[PDB]
Amino acid sequence: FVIRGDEVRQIAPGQTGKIADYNYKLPDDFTGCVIAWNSNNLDSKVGGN
């Protein structure tokens, strides 16, 4: 999925906030790798995407 860079801190086990609680809840015992990169060269537009 795609999100705003400031919000990426919520993509970790046991977090809280609008992304964590209304969009994508990781379990507290998550086993896995969270991988992320800036995509402004693909996902961004003048006047807004």
Binding site: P13, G14, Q15, T16, D28
Partner: protein, 49 residues
Amino acid sequence: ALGKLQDVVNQNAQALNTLVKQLSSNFGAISSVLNDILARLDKVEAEVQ
């Protein structure tokens, strides 16, 4: 006169009052009260306290 029997009573009361007074201790946690910990902290931090 009955010092040995009163001593056995007093030692069991001293042991139980000690066992209950130990609920008031922090043991290094932010508070000695679980509902205070559970109100101050988010899940992953509350679990450590």
